[PDB]
Amino acid sequence: QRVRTVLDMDDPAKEETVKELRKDINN
Amino acid sequence: EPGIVTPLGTLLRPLNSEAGKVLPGWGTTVLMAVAILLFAVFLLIILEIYNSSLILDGVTNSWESLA
Amino acid sequence: MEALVYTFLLIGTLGIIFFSIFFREPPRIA
Amino acid sequence: MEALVYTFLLIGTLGIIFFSIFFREPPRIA
Amino acid sequence: MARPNPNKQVVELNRSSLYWGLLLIFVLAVLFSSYIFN
Amino acid sequence: MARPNPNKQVVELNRSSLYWGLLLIFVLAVLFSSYIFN
Amino acid sequence: GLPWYRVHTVVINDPGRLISVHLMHTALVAGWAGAMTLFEIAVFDPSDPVLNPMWRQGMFVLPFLTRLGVTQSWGGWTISGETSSNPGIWSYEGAAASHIVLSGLLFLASVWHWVYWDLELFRDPRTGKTALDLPKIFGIHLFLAGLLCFGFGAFHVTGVFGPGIWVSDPYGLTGSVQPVAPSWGAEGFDPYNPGGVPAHHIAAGILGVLAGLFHLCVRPSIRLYFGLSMGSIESVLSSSIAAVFWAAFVVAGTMWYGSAATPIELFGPTRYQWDQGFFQQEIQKRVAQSTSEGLSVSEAWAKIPEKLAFYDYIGNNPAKGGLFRTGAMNSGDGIAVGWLGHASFKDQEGRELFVRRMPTFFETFPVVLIDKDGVVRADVPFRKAESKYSIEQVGVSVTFYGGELNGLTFTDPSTVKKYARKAQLGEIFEFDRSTLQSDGVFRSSPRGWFTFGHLSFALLFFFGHIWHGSRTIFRDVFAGIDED
Amino acid sequence: ERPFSDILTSIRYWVIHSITVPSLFIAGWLFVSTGLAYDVFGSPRPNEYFTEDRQDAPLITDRFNALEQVKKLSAQ
Amino acid sequence: SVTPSLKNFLLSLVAGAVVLAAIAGAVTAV
Amino acid sequence: VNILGLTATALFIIIPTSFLLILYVKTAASE
Amino acid sequence: VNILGLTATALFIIIPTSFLLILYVKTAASE
Amino acid sequence: IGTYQEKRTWFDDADDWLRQDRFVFVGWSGLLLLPCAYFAVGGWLTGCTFVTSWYTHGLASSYIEGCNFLTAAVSTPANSLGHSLLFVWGPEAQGDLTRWFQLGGLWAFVALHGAFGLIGFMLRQFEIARSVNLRPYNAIAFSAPIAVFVSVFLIYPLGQSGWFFAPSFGVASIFRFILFFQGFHNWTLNPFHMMGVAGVLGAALLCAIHGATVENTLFEDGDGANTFRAFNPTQAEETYSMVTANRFWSQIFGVAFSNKRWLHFFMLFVPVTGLWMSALGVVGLALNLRAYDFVSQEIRAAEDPEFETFYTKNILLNEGIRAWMAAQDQPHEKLTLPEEVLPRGNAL
Amino acid sequence: IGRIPLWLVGTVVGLLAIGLLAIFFYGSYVGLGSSL
Amino acid sequence: IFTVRWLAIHAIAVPTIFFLGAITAMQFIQR
């Protein structure tokens, strides 16, 4: 449900996912 | 010496009869200009769409467009 | 893999038959 | 099996070097 | 124009160009043998 | 007898003999392929 | 005389043999197409359409067969899983037989055109010398091209007469051949939208018909005639080869990037989907939904389809093979038999670690275990001396859910290392290897081989277009110069 | 035709180039010494090499909002 | 609606037309 | 024997065929 | 590709060498 | 033209003013070649003194940071941008030149304008060859440099993830790209690359041997030791004894050239063939299709701990290359590989 | 016209370029990027 | 004058000396 938890779940696997490349200007 | 004469050859002879018939003047270079520039801007539109260099209200250029 | 070799050899044989029949040296009659 | 092919094709290469060296077309002075 | 063809042509290639072609194929085999073998 | 060889001969093989040779090789291959492949 | 690199210039000014050699090239291409798909059907294994699809077997022309609408076969099986009770005349090897009979007809026509070359059609009634009415020939050919494009876009893909096309879901799960309605807006120009293809072909056909009519009407001028070397057929040759490597670059780009007419289900995935975590993101948000509302990660992994996990594998990447890793992907890694589930790694204190995904650029990659915050917690120890990151001293256990292994937690260091190395490549799958003598390395997809071959062909044709441009503009000084 | 021989040896050519070349040299000196390149260019000075927030190399990691992203990751 | 990317596209194309006109003027001004 | 026989068959169908083609073309190009 | 390499290398040697030899003896037959 | 009246128009006036003798030939091809080449060289020379790579690659690549000539480079755009062209007006920069420089968009700008400059230079060769009417074998040989340029600056990044893996405009950056293909691709073991290196060293062979042979079998034409003035621009006789050259090389090497035309054409032939095959090889590399692993040799090395070869030494050195590459060459992967996981030998 | 010799002009240009090259090589031991 | 050779020389003469003076100032830039 939460997009921030799946963001931190995809990050240790890879740092090039489209959802990590979109709306990451907050980080 | 003549060639091989055939009915369909006699039928479609006017398709290949005026080998080299041309008109004087420059012809249609203004439409060369406008059509070539239109093809150019069209090809750039599709290039920048496929490059994700242009963003519209209906294009995504991603696999979810299959939905 | 053997069947393709067999079929190739036979189609080559029929090719040689067709070649010998239709593109032979004409008799000279001289 | 591969060593035989390598050796045969390489000795063929050097043999055709020998052929091109000695058995070449003699140029003409005319 | 007539029944025989005007473009009746003979193709030629001297033994020097034979040497060029055969050495080309032989060294191509040298280059690609370890790759097709893998 | 001289510096060039006097027994200089030209080897001939016409198109009909080419036909016979090609057919002989291909028919021999067709016949013996089943036994060579075993 | 003419050297070996000029032999075909015996038919530069002979239109009968030009038509004849075009006919026999067409015959050879059609015969190759038929023989190639016969070979592909002979060597195809339809045992598992999901875990061993056609692009995992190196099928090349068969995905193109399945692209346009031919899905069933006379062997009683369809690639989508259904059984072809009445596959009809147009099966895979039925289309092969059609190609073969077309090739035979074209070969006979080629022999006829060679033996009958002195046709008065190639003789103009003005002077009787050899000439071709190039403006009218191009106008006629453009008219036929427009008519065929409009028909293909108005009846074949629209499905009112034809079968439509193969459209799949964004993540390539279901897939189906159906009619597609035209998209007349910017969505029609969306390259991943299949609704633009009928509109594209309809508009292209209408424009081609009008342009061919205008060509049939109006003749060219003297200035372009003496500029573009209009009098030479080699100008047509140079322009046509320019157009075909234009299209070659187009098809190489659209195959490497993916588009509407390039389905993942038929042609394999793209390396950019792996590098963008597309299937992984799909699976993980399919987990976030139905995990955030109860029924936690102990179960519901079986709710994850097995095709999706097969897609989340770097061996499924089209850019993991080599130039000479030759053949089928199954001959590379073995045929997938089942999914073992997503590996969850946990260390001795409780945080959930994750294995780093392998970048496409690497043939080998070290195995590391990273925390949620993005700092490496463990690694496969190369040195194993004065190392304090090894699994043998950290204490990481691996657990699986929803697959052949579900709820099983391994704590043994050797097996957790081995399965971490297996999960380094993505998902975890079991592969049968002794049936095809699998070497071990990864192979390349038909999409990747297609793109490589067409890029090389496009470069060679660029060289050919430069050479033919020189040939066209310099048709007067080949044998020598004017020496004055 | 003036084939590069009389031109360089001509006092008329030399006098009019006794000012322009030093002027260009001085302008090029001042364009870097006054920091105008740093201003209109976006290149970071060694004193403003790093910000206080990040001690490491900058990472854009975006494609569309990269303009305002490099705005907030540059040296202001 | 009209996107900023499309606005920049229109500005770039009219700028290219201006560049073409400037090229024509510079080449005809001997 | 599944592929050694293939190699033997290939050599047998080419080498004398090539030799015959050499002699045939050597005669055909001479009038 | 242990002996697939054999057959591929064999045909890659054979086809150009027979082709070049045929056209060469075509050249050399006419003086 | 064509014995018709042909009233002079704007096209005729432009052609007559364009194809004429000047110090620099403008012609029609100068409508593109001059502005595109000028923009490319200006952008590169500006980049090697000004453009910092601290936001594109996180490196130093210009004289403004203290770099020298080799380490200065016009750096590629960030891989997060993918294969975007990075227009200054486009969504990456949106009209702001100052931050368009920090985006690395001038890499794509200079690469594009240099491709158009290559096109314009070939068109200039074709136009000159048309203007004074001899064969365009210079353009035929020039077909290979543009093939190399396309295949390494556009085909490889378009096949890979993005322009970040494309080479950057700069000597040390080209060296980085070269070692990148050495490690990731095993470019030395690539067959098309061996085709290319063989062609190029053979081109060096032919150039050196042709110059030395011509200058060493010269006729007298003398009564003076400076043979350079022995040549006259207007003469229809040979200046170097080719038959003596043929005898010398037949007795030294075993074979020799019997034709100046075929000699010069093969001198043309060797580097164009080499560069075209190298272009095909890097095109093959563009889609991760390499001549990396020999399957049988790696198998016997796996089941034989004593079977050491130079090929296996190269393979192991390449994964060592890549293991050291990843962390400091791929910031967007942020691969925080620890010291222990790095493969290394005893001592050192 | 020929009042200043061409060899003199070339000598001045060459000494300017050589001294500037010496300055640039001096700029590798001081200033930015000089390991100090 | 303003000839084609004039423009061709100046477009490569003015900016190169501009950046040349830039590098000359840039060598003496301290830390």
Ligand code: CLA
């Ligand atoms: C459909 C495109 C096309 C067509 C119709 C032609 C037609 C022609 N070309 Mg040409 N060419 C092309 C593309 C094309 N070319 C391309 C892409 C290149 C770049 C490589 C060239 C480079 C080229 C050169 C350098 C020359 C020609 C020449 C010629 C003329 C004589 C050809 C000949 O007899 O050589 C004979 C060719 C052979 C005997 C065998 C060639 C086959 C090679 C070895 C590879 C084998 C391929 C395989 C069997 C099939 C693969 C095909 C498939 C992958 C596409 C002829 C009119 C010649 C010319 O202009 O006359 C002065 C000339 O010298 N071409």
Ligand code: CLA
């Ligand atoms: C558009 C062209 C094209 C493309 C993209 C493909 C692609 C593919 N083919 Mg295919 N094929 C083609 C044309 C093509 N083919 C043609 C024209 C034929 C008829 C001869 C075949 C016959 C064929 C068969 C029989 C098979 C395939 C197979 C395959 C798949 C396995 C990968 C592979 O090819 O190995 C690797 C690709 C390469 C190594 C490319 C080689 C690069 C160049 C050409 C190197 C050679 C140059 C050098 C001078 C040769 C000297 C070597 C010599 C010493 C032996 C793959 C997806 C296999 C398959 O999966 O079944 C369907 C299979 O068994 N193909």
Ligand code: CLA
């Ligand atoms: C009766 C006509 C006909 C029909 C119905 C088919 C049907 C089919 N063919 Mg086929 N073919 C034909 C004729 C035909 N063919 C002929 C005459 C040849 C010899 C040249 C071939 C050679 C051939 C081969 C080699 C192959 C097929 C294949 C196929 C199958 C898949 C098609 C595909 O994916 O390729 C894609 C087709 C296209 C992408 C068509 C694109 C057309 C181009 C891009 C036109 C663009 C240029 C044009 C001038 C632009 C006009 C300008 C405009 C403004 C007007 C399919 C069932 C494939 C197969 O699986 O084998 C069975 C395959 O390998 N065919």
Ligand code: CLA
């Ligand atoms: C030889 C002339 C020439 C050519 C061929 C090009 C070509 C190109 N330039 Mg370039 N440029 C030039 C001169 C030229 N330039 C000059 C002199 C300058 C200095 C001002 C620039 C500065 C420049 C920059 C800063 C950039 C480019 C870029 C580009 C590329 C893409 C341009 C684009 O996005 O839209 C294409 C433009 C055209 C196709 C122009 C044609 C105009 C059409 C045919 C007419 C339509 C306009 C019409 C009036 C519409 C209004 C109708 C209305 C009244 C209703 C492209 C290949 C971009 C790039 O390199 O990408 C990285 C980029 O950012 N150029």
Ligand SMILES: C=Cc1c(C)c2cc3nc(c4c5[nH]c(cc6nc(cc1[nH]2)C(C)=C6CC)c(C)c5C(=O)[C@@H]4C(=O)OC)[C@@H](CCC(=O)OC/C=C(\C)CCC[C@H](C)CCC[C@H](C)CCCC(C)C)[C@@H]3C
């Ligand atoms: C790295 C090696 C190398 C360089 C630098 C080079 C340079 C050159 N070759 C030319 C020609 C040729 N090259 C040829 C064959 C070859 N050339 C080769 C190797 C080279 N050739 C090889 C190996 C071959 C064998 C096939 C031929 C056949 C020709 C010609 O016809 C021509 C000539 O007459 O030779 C004297 C000249 C015309 C270029 C020009 O004005 O384009 C105009 C376009 C320009 C200037 C724009 C280019 C801008 C580039 C693409 C982007 C920016 C790059 C920066 C400026 C520099 C970046 C450098 C870093 C990457 C380190 C130029 C001096």
Ligand SMILES: CC(C)=CCC/C(C)=C/CC/C(C)=C/CC/C(C)=C/CC/C(C)=C/CC/C(C)=C/CC/C(C)=C/CC/C(C)=C/CC/C(C)=C/CC1=CC(=O)C(C)=C(C)C1=O
């Ligand atoms: C057991 C065994 C045998 C051990 C050894 C095994 C071994 C390790 C084998 C590997 C070797 C091998 C072949 C591997 C290499 C594989 C590979 C790279 C293949 C090469 C592929 C190839 C075809 C490249 C094509 C690219 C290209 C066209 C280059 C060709 C280069 C070429 C031939 C150039 C000529 C070179 C050269 C020697 C020039 C001599 C020319 C010459 C005689 C000029 C002299 C001369 C000058 C004048 O001025 C005049 C006037 C006259 C008159 C005159 O004459």
Ligand SMILES: CC1=C(/C=C/C(C)=C/C=C/C(C)=C/C=C/C=C(C)/C=C/C=C(C)/C=C/C2=C(C)CCCC2(C)C)C(C)(C)CCC1
């Ligand atoms: C006569 C007849 C018939 C029959 C027909 C047929 C049977 C056909 C066929 C055919 C076929 C069965 C074909 C196939 C084929 C193949 C091909 C045509 C191919 C090829 C080639 C190529 C092109 C290649 C190249 C290459 C190589 C060599 C390798 C790899 C790489 C490359 C690519 C380079 C019929 C009954 C109908 C009718 C009547 C009579």
Ligand SMILES: CC1=C(/C=C/C(C)=C\C=C\C(C)=C\C=C\C=C(C)\C=C\C=C(C)\C=C\C2=C(C)CCCC2(C)C)C(C)(C)CCC1
């Ligand atoms: C960027 C850009 C642009 C463009 C520009 C241009 C087009 C121009 C230019 C420019 C240039 C062009 C510059 C330059 C530089 C240069 C230099 C820097 C140089 C050098 C050289 C040297 C340093 C050397 C010396 C020497 C010596 C000392 C020794 C011996 C001799 C010699 C000579 C070698 C613009 C703005 C539009 C915008 C976009 C981007």
Ligand SMILES: CC1=C(/C=C/C(C)=C\C=C\C(C)=C\C=C\C=C(C)\C=C\C=C(C)\C=C\C2=C(C)CCCC2(C)C)C(C)(C)CCC1
């Ligand atoms: C290569 C070249 C050139 C040249 C340049 C230059 C830059 C030159 C110079 C130079 C110089 C500018 C020189 C000077 C000098 C002087 C000297 C070399 C001297 C001496 C001697 C001695 C022995 C010493 C002594 C002493 C002592 C012991 C210590 C102190 C005192 C005294 C000084 C007395 C030219 C352009 C023409 C042409 C082209 C290239």
Ligand SMILES: [Fe+2]
């Ligand atoms: Fe010479």
